[PDB]
UniProtKB/Swiss-Prot annotation, chain C:
It comes from Escherichia coli (strain K12). It comes from the Bacteria. It is found in: Cytoplasm; Membrane. Homohexamer composed of three dimers. InterPro entries: Glutamate_decarboxylase, PyrdxlP-dep_de-COase, PyrdxlP-dep_Trfase, PyrdxlP-dep_Trfase_major, Pyridoxal-P_BS. This is Glutamate decarboxylase beta. GO terms for biological process: glutamate catabolic process; intracellular pH elevation. Its EC number is 4.1.1.15. It catalyses: L-glutamate + H(+) = 4-aminobutanoate + CO2. The keyword Nucleotidyltransferase does not apply. Substrate binds at residues 60, 81. Converts glutamate to gamma-aminobutyrate (GABA), consuming one intracellular proton in the reaction. The gad system helps to maintain a near-neutral intracellular pH when cells are exposed to extremely acidic conditions. The ability to survive transit through the acidic conditions of the stomach is essential for successful colonization of the mammalian host by commensal and pathogenic bacteria. It is an enzyme of class 4 (lyase). The modification N6-acetyllysine is found at residues 444, 451.
Length: 450, 450, 451, 450
């Protein structure tokens, strides 16, 4: 009989009075029975509060805010499968438009074909691996032609992001990473060349180093490679990892030569969901021409009576991000992006200037558009001790919900501890002022409590 | 004067009356100026109508519908980055619960420290490549131990999905694919063994073949491999590609032994956004134990005063799907999933029965839960000419917005043309009846027009 | 133990997991029990996907898009009964303001009572029948005065829309329809006169012919009728069927004299839900003065102390459309409408120009504001053969969701097959370009597959 | 120089601080310029408040409330054109399902080919005119056959609704309306017959008289017509005007024989937007068989290879209501409707009982389901005077927003003043109690102020 009583409650009982919400959520085995949808939702929604406030997350590089239209486009495309080119043809079409534009944006040679050579991706990581395989294949072919061994390929680069380490491991490539050293936290021409040989599949400059936020200018490295060929006959290509810079420089530092204007640059990759203003789940990779992308890596698909080529490690995935990306392009344009990016740099500059007045800080990065991304990276002046450590400050800030990372650099600077503040879209001046206030407040506390 | 008149219009002009919407959308170069967001949105929204109705797309296997709560959870997590374990800790937590849960659904051995060994992925593709590298590495190690060459690895499998071909290409592995042949459109024990040798990294059965919708039972293949070892001493492992079956059999055919109940199965993968009921952008891969996943492939990350391992090709990406998947698990449970899956099978069976009464057909798949996924896959009886070809029929149906594919099988059955109807969640009986009606209607037309 | 088991499911089951959605929808008898509202809704919502995409329906003349405000106004007025003038007084009031504004747009003589004479309708059809009865009654009275028989009334017109045929049938009037003939797909002065007599209740020019999209200019027909009276003493009135043109010309071709500027025009009708930008369910009909509308057809109703006359076939009905129409008027005004209408003509012109370069077509309408509505109408150049009929092409386009009709004209042109593309609000340039693309694509396929 | 200001203002000004809202709305000529959409909306929205509260409108018979789903279905179908059968096929399909269902509800002979004869309409009015022409045509044909004059047709009826008067006028038919008289406010058998002749096209009983809310039982009238034919050989048909009753009796008084169970009833009409629970803009008319509907009144249109007849005065119009009506049918069914209608009757009965205790009243309708619609209709007992008139009361109640009509009956009862309260869906008991309270309060005031 109670089954009826209990059943009436499953019905009328409120949400927090419901019996279904009186136990802890399952975490070990697949649940047995179904439950009130509202309770299940409520439970998960509430658990998520423990993630903290994304808008206050100053560690991430990825977008933490989206405009109303992107939200709608995403919900509208929650089921559009980016991979089924023939089934969702217009989405496929839009994707191609974006490839042209990004390629265009990066000064790629006008596609005489009428359609730039590139592809969308879940993020820069996939993009990089695509670019990676591209290089390994191009290299492999070249060596086989000159009848040389192709079993000891290596990749030369500076302080790259973890995904390159992953590439090297998964595709068995020796990663020759020029280490960071006091005074030079990046790959310089000299040390680069000293690492190149006939087995080098390419060099990967990082146009926007994660750890520091500074650009790794390709120009000088490009020259060095030109000379290197003149001296050894070894022709080395470049792949720019512009996850960050890719959607920054083009708008606020158009004179920095880092893209396809450089001959050795055969491919560029960037994260659309970082400064590209697209929602998480979007990356881009562009090749300078059909000759830069080995046909053996491309798998053709049926697209509108013809055949379009694909090259992606993933398969089925939402098309929402690409659609949104295209939206931001049409809605903002160069003008728009510039204004938005400036806003970020403006804030980064401000914080850098202000924070400098509150302690013995040596700034590694101060949001100068001609030097890198809208970031503020710094460490304690060597030797000097203010009473705290950057780790300490960080913690204090976390008490107000802020996530401002404090970490050690790598290579030959493992004893240098820096703090890095990222100024993404949606971290307006007024909001950043609050950060500053809590920063001053934190110092005061650390002072009164040695 | 003019600029002000123009501007006042840019301000009061209605959406369609405005000047910004009087030109074709940009598709070749990055836009120069910003424009009214409502126009930009409208343009894109409308272009998307050319994608067709996803609910009527009977070709895809991925979810084309999501409940109200998933929509909310997705919008709420539009900016949660699944990769930043330390920054969005609870999302990370929830993900782990999921793995546990999936591993449980597949009989994985009682996990160690309360946490099964697995990872979430963008889709089955990434999952499979993860499982792939796992095998190659396990094999490589083994061979090096016995001091044998590891430069000629091959993978044995039946009619796999394109991602495996991609795996083989990207990771340089010989793909030995047992071809489909009339009467046997899958990998049989005999032909499998004839393809295995000491260089075989593993066998990949496809628990839910795409082309036909039928299961490729691992049991028989497993026995064959047991014997094979007894005769050659060669121990071969399996990796089940359960993109489809993975979230079907467990609920409607629990007695089919295909998972971890089989000793040789070291890893299983499945598409969460297919029959897992998760929105696009979610896949799963589980390993039998810590010994099946080579530590060299794992990159530890900081997480809750300790180190957690991560294995993925991607990096930054939305955590929405994993959060949603967890939701569907708690809200539905075995009971729920069963009910939902049954609904699908019920429809597939209905269509298969009805369609049979309208033409000279030989069914390859008829929505039998004990044979495979909820799909209807048939062909014209060898030697019959009803007046039309399945291609013709597909096109007549598209006239009503339906997408019912007609294609040729591969291997030794390249001259066999089949039609395949997928019955996903959200293709209820009443809705399928309408397909049937249009089906009958199409036949009538094709009849009246020889 | 089973009813509770099954009940708990009714409660907890998923939408599609639910048992209620495991059967086909009822279609023969009134359902017996109630069911989960969400399921019932889901079922219907999904069936509707089979209607196709309205935005891609290039056959219809009626609005296929509405702004956010109209949507709200409609939702807000889902229960306001347009007929209960005394119960929903302000709606009634707003309605009247519209009649005044339409009458003003059409130059109707300025009313001295302050309120023009006209009424709102569900659509042009009802409007036309109201205008029809008006004429029959005016005629009937006139004849009875001159002591003549009133049992053989006829109506003269060109290629009218089906509703007129319906009028003729329902109200027993002989319909003398001047047939379309190659080179002249409309009613010309000469053939018109040859059909008029003392039994003719009136002539109905169609200011925006459906089949071709061209205007049927009243000016010349008006003159002809003036002469006709001078020679026979027979005074014939006109009723313009401006379902389309009514809300087009006034903004993009103000010089075309077709409205009340013409003396014989006693009444005009137009579809508000067509180019009037109102949501489906709105039409208008205006009379030039209180003398053009026979009081015997009017039913006065109590309205705020005084009296107000009601002339309409339908009784109860949504006031939403009227309210929305008024909104569009205030929000857009002449300026607004003009910009919107231009956008349409602009697209129609573009398509017409581009499609012409793809084959041996002879155009019947190129979207010129001075000739007709925003539409592109055409046929295959007489005696030509590119390897396909316009019907085939139509089909090829349906495969992309487009609905572009291909049909045969009537009268003496029954062997001429045309295709007609309608460019309504919400068929922006970028969107139309996609149509063009698919059009080129269709031709290519038809080419590679002669069979 | 001032313009640029007016513009900047028209851009930032709030809705009410804007200049566009400082003038009275245009009401004489078509506006010249466009204006801020928000202002235009606001203006109209606010004017509409002067309409009063529809939920409190107890004079109307039409729905004044709709469930959330109907609202969505209506918004979803704001652009579906009910007339374009070929262009919006499924809506057309749904429509037909309703026709069968209503026919089934009224006991029409089970259709011959799975489809009953009838059509949807904007409201009962159009439905009645369709039924009217039907009769005139049937009659006309009959007479022509027997070679008799067809220029003096008349229609016999009781206290019909205004639309019939309109029918008579527009289609030139003599309306013989048996007048209401004290003690008999409806058409009785005897006076009906005394009005019938060979020129009578039919008799129209009103199954739910507006003025009083009581049913006009067809049974007795039907018998009288049977006899009439036996004595004169004149066969007269009936057309029931069940605008109200049509969707009431079937559920709460199934034993009242008034529909197609009666042989002479060749057509029935009813307002779906009244007690059919459909939103305004929906009516129905059903014919007993293909022989009752003159093919000359039908016009055919191409629909799915075939064709279907369309009898309808209107043309283009929304399909939302029909779609909603179908929804209410499936969601409620007999069970549902019965529960909803009972709720209304229950309220009507309650008010009738309570109001009777407040003054010297004589009731004409007390919400009995076996006598008529859920309404309360009373007058002051003859020659009795409480100190007011039903007009005063009506007015006093209006002061609280209530619209409770007080009017005089017609015919030979023009000196009888009645008050009529309509109890539609959405006038629940608790709500009605408030009316009662204000009713008592009104009486008290009228008492203290002679
Ligand atoms: C952030 C970043 C990546 C990773 O890109 P995702 O979008 O996370 O896939 C790779 N390289 C660099 C230099 C980065 O900053
Ligand atoms: C659909 C499918 C895949 C690809 O799944 P994704 O989610 O797109 O990665 C892989 N394998 C099989 C057997 C499949 O059916
Ligand atoms: C569309 C049209 C009609 C029909 O009027 P509705 O508003 O659709 O009821 C009548 N006449 C003409 C000339 C039309 O174009
Ligand atoms: C309300 C009513 C009508 C009017 O029909 P509408 O649905 O209002 O168009 C006609 N007859 C009767 C008996 C009515 O009650
Ligand atoms: Br609560
Ligand atoms: Br609650
Ligand atoms: Br956001
Ligand atoms: Br340093
Ligand atoms: Br507009
Ligand atoms: Br707008
Ligand atoms: Br959805
Ligand atoms: Br076969
Ligand atoms: Br579900
Ligand atoms: Br649900
Ligand atoms: Br819309
Ligand atoms: Br012609
Ligand atoms: Br304000
Ligand atoms: Br405001
Ligand atoms: Br409501
Ligand atoms: Br009485």
């Amino acid at each position: 009989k109670k089954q009826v009583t209990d059943l009436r409650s499953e019905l009328l009982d409120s949400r927090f009075g419901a019996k279904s919400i009186s136990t802890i959520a399952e975490s070990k085995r697949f649940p047995l029975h179904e439950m009130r949808d509202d309770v299940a939702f409520q439970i998960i929604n509430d658990e998520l509060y423990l993630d903290g406030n994304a808008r206050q997350n100053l560690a991430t590089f990825c977008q933490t805010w989206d405009d109303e239209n992107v939200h709608k486009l995403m919900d509208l495309s929650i089921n559009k499968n980016w991979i089924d080119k023939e089934e969702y043809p217009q989405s496929a079409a839009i994707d191609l438009r974006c490839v042209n534009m990004v390629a265009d944006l990066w000064h790629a040679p006008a596609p005489k074909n009428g359609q730039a050579v590139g592809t969308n991706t879940i993020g820069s990581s996939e993009a990089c691996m695509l670019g990676g395989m591209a290089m390994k294949w191009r290299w492999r072919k070249r060596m086989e032609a000159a009848g040389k061994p192709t079993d000891k390929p290596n990749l030369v680069c500076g302080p790259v992001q973890i995904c390159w380490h992953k590439f090297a491991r998964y595709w068995d490539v020796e990663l020759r990473e020029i280490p960071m050293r006091p005074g030079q936290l990046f790959m310089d021409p000299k040390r680069m060349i000293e690492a190149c040989d006939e087995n080098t599949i390419g060099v990967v400059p990082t146009f926007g180093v994660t750890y520091t936020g500074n650009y790794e200018f390709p120009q000088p490295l490009h020259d060095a490679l030109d000379k290197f060929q003149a001296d050894t006959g070894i022709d080395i290509d470049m792949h720019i990892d512009a996850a960050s810079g890719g959607f920054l420089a083009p708008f606020v530092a158009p004179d920095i030569v880092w893209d396809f204007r450089l001959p050795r640059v055969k491919s560029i990759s960037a994260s659309g969901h970082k400064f590209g203003l697209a929602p998480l789940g979007c990356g881009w990779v562009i090749w300078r021409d059909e000759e830069a992308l080995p046909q053996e890596l491309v798998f053709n698909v049926d697209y509108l009576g013809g055949q379009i080529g694909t090259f992606a490690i993933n398969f089925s995935r939402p098309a929402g991000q690409v659609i949104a990306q295209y939206y931001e392009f049409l809605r903002l344009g160069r003008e728009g992006y510039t204004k938005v990016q400036n806003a970020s740099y403006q804030v980064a500059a401000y914080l850098a200037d202000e924070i400098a007045k509150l302690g013995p800080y040596e700034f590694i990065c101060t949001g100068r558009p001609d030097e890198g991304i809208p970031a503020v990276c710094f460490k304690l002046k060597d030797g000097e001790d203010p009473g705290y450590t950057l780790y300490d400050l960080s913690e204090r800030l976390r008490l107000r919900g802020w996530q401002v990372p404090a970490f050690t650099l790598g290579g030959e600077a493992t004893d240098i501890v820096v703090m890095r503040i990222m100024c993404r879209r949606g971290f307006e001046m007024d909001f950043a002022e609050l950060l500053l206030e809590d920063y001053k407040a934190s110092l005061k506390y650390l002072s009164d409590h040695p």
